[PDB]
Amino acid sequence: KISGGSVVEMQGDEMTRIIWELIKEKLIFPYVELDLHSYDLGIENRDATNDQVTKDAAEAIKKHNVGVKCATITPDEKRVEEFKLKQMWKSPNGTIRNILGGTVFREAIICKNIPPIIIGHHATDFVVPGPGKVEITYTPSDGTQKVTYLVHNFEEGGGVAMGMYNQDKSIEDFAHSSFQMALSKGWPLYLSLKKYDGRFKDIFQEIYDKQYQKIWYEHRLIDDMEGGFIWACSLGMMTSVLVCPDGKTVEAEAAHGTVTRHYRMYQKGQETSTNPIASIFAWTRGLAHRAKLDNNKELAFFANALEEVSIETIEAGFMTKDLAACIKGLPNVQRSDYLNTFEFMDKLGENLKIKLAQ
Amino acid sequence: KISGGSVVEMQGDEMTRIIWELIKEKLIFPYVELDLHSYDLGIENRDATNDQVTKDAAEAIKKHNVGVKCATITPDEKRVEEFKLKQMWKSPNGTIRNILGGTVFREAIICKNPIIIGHHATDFVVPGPGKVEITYTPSDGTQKVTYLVHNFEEGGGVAMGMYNQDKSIEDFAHSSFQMALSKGWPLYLSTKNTILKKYDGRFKDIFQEIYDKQYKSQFEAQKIWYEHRLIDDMVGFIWACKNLGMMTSVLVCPDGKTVEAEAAHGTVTRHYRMYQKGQETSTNPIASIFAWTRGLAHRAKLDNNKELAFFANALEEVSIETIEAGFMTKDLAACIKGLPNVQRSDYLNTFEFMDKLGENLKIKLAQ
Ligand SMILES: NC(=O)C1=CN([C@@H]2O[C@H](COP(=O)(O)OP(=O)(O)OC[C@H]3O[C@@H](n4cnc5c(N)ncnc54)[C@H](OP(=O)(O)O)[C@@H]3O)[C@@H](O)[C@H]2O)C=CC1
Ligand SMILES: NC(=O)C1=CN([C@@H]2O[C@H](COP(=O)(O)OP(=O)(O)OC[C@H]3O[C@@H](n4cnc5c(N)ncnc54)[C@H](OP(=O)(O)O)[C@@H]3O)[C@@H](O)[C@H]2O)C=CC1
Ligand SMILES: Cc1cc(Cc2ccccc2)n(O)c(=O)c1
């Protein structure tokens, strides 16, 4: 077995929980020995501990640099009363991002036989009750100006208004996170309201021509946009990763939800077919990041190995039903066109056993 | 020949100009008689008249309530060079939009081989540290109100105001409620109401206030409903967002009487250079055709015109079912068979297609 080392992991809810556990027992643990800081973000436990788990889990990732996360129920009223929760807790993902900062990137994992671009997403509002001047003013600390622009003069009636700002530091991190990400995967980096959308283009350049292999960075406007590039701005084939400012701390995740609908059938004892891909990839993305930070060769090969098998397995035909519908189209899918959740998992572990054997 | 009545029409530019003329020659004029208020919004005539025609065309739609626009060139520094324009004129739609007001509505066109979507600035650079604020002095001498946007203590950055008048939202509301009745589809508004509690909280309210005092009766009188939702709970209906030869844009006014319709794409300059040069092309008319069929549809609703009303639907089918039957333009061919695998014998070119559409409208109509 391999020496994986420090890894913060968070168990989640419902159908993804069940899948998460399988991923571990059938793909991870049979191959890798990890220093595993486990946190249970399952809904009943978060409620029990007053979302405290979540806070510590977050401190843990800050502290160990690697985080993989299972999907977690976010509470609304139906849920507050379904689990008889003592509060409408906030989204765990909300909590974690706050504590960590940095920027999220989503990637569709591309299986050649189904019908890659990596996209990286990145105020005071009030009501005007009636006519009057609304003016957005700026006051240096050495008060040598007093730019104050008129936003609008209301005469019609009242209305609504707001003031959005953005700090340089925060723009820099974006570009940092962006450029770094763009190196790590060796893909062209692109980035897409005069002076605002503006100063962005600026700082990127200033940081490109100062800190950053046959690869380029550029600029565009939305519409102009083969594949295979980073870009600042099925579901079970989507993978979200939070890259922090420091470029050391990473937290990976499936970009879908807890798949309640599927889980509900599971509870009825009905066969399911849930796409483990997005979840598996979150693991590998973090495990390869574990590797990079440690210079662990064996593991670094393993994470890749696992990412490989998962495509090859779908490519050799064997796949889950959501994927079966992309090919066949929902209405005309035979059972014999896909595997259920457990059979799929069985097939991976099998192909993985074998791929790792050579 | 069905009499249609008062119709404002605006001829446009380049490729779309050509298609427009065919659309009238082969599919409209042979079946419908119209009191036509034409205006030529070609770049030439617009220039030669100091964009007066555009302004006239506007005031005329305001008047007769039904405008159908052919796509028109908006000039940029480059276009000006080419045409020797005496100014870089503002977009027609921009000027048209302002005179009539209202909200635009795009509609993708479904062939088995529907969702309508309606959408709706003071930036400046913070050099270094200091304070960014926004004020509201009320015009009635009451106490001036100050909000902190943010204190920049390290570097600078950037900041910006945004605003909106009540009146504008109300208009946004009406147009959408009118739009929902017109279509027989239920309506949804999407906001960032949790984040912009005070801002979007205003849209949501106004939609509700207007829904209940004005439209709740009529919606149920059609077995449909309006509802609010947040942007992620969102992802046969009308969707109000607070923010190709198969795409139809429609300006709807709040009075719900006036309406104006046009193809969403542009003037298709590429095909047109290819056309000037004399090579065959395969431009998609459908979107343009559809401007006519909403325009007519609307007039037919306004004027209690059962015979014209039927014509419109009749045509709308024909276009759909000509594609749905394997007869199509390259862009749609390519949609099915993949750009690299499209062959000549998979599509028909601009003229040939119009013919088929022509031939079929006859048949459909003879029944
Ligand atoms: N913490 C997190 O990571 C997130 C959690 N959530 C939470 O999840 C809960 C319920 O999830 P919900 O949004 O309803 O559904 P999901 O977001 O999990 O996905 C909805 C539908 O997409 C399809 N789908 C998604 N993922 C998969 C997969 N891995 N394999 C197969 N099919 C898939 C299924 O389609 P079909 O209906 O056809 O089966 C599913 O019902 C909510 O309480 C919400 O708070 C939501 C987003 C992110
Ligand atoms: N009046 C109006 O409402 C509008 C006017 N315009 C004006 O038009 C001018 C030029 O337009 P431009 O943006 O170059 O071109 P378009 O925006 O019309 O179209 C962009 C490209 O998409 C494809 N395409 C669009 N419509 C069709 C169709 N019906 N059938 C087949 N293919 C289509 C063509 O590319 P391909 O070669 O890939 O087939 C075309 O080159 C601009 O100066 C602009 O001001 C633009 C938008 C709206
Ligand atoms: C310049 C301009 C263009 C359009 C049409 C348009 C063209 C391309 C993308 C979107 C919309 N409209 O409507 C305007 O008001 C102004």
UniProtKB/Swiss-Prot annotation, chain B:
Sites bearing Phosphotyrosine, chain numbering: Y39
Residues with the N6-succinyllysine modification: K356
Cofactor field: Mg(2+); Mn(2+)
Free-text comment on the cofactor: Binds 1 Mg(2+) or Mn(2+) ion per subunit.
Primary location recorded for the protein, binned into one broad class: cytoplasm
Residue numbers binding substrate: T74, S91, P92, N93, G94, T95, I96, R97, R106, H119, K192
Enzyme Commission number(s): 1.1.1.42
Compartments where found: Cytoplasm, Cytosol; Peroxisome
Modified residues (Phosphoserine): S345
Entries under InterPro entries matching the protein: IsoCit/isopropylmalate_DH_CS, Isocitrate_DH_NADP, IsoPropMal-DH-like_dom
Binding site for Mn(2+): D232
Keyword annotations from UniProtKB, A to Z: Acetylation, Cytoplasm, Glyoxylate bypass, Magnesium, Manganese, Metal-binding, NADP, Oxidoreductase, Peroxisome, Phosphoprotein, Tricarboxylic acid cycle
The keyword Oxidoreductase appears for this protein: yes
One GO biological process term: glyoxylate cycle
A GO cellular-component term linked to this record: secretory granule lumen
GO MF annotation: an example: isocitrate dehydrogenase (NADP+) activity
Post-translational modifications: Acetylation at Lys-330 dramatically reduces catalytic activity.
Catalytic reaction annotation: D-threo-isocitrate + NADP(+) = 2-oxoglutarate + CO2 + NADPH
Protein function: Catalyzes the NADP(+)-dependent oxidative decarboxylation of isocitrate (D-threo-isocitrate) to 2-ketoglutarate (2-oxoglutarate), which is required by other enzymes such as the phytanoyl-CoA dioxygenase. Plays a critical role in the generation of NADPH, an important cofactor in many biosynthesis pathways. May act as a corneal epithelial crystallin and may be involved in maintaining corneal epithelial transparency.
Clinical note on disease: Glioma: Gliomas are benign or malignant central nervous system neoplasms derived from glial cells. They comprise astrocytomas and glioblastoma multiforme that are derived from astrocytes, oligodendrogliomas derived from oligodendrocytes and ependymomas derived from ependymocytes.
UniProt subunit comment: Homodimer.
Protein name: Isocitrate dehydrogenase [NADP] cytoplasmic
Biological source species: Homo sapiens
Gene this chain is encoded by: IDH1
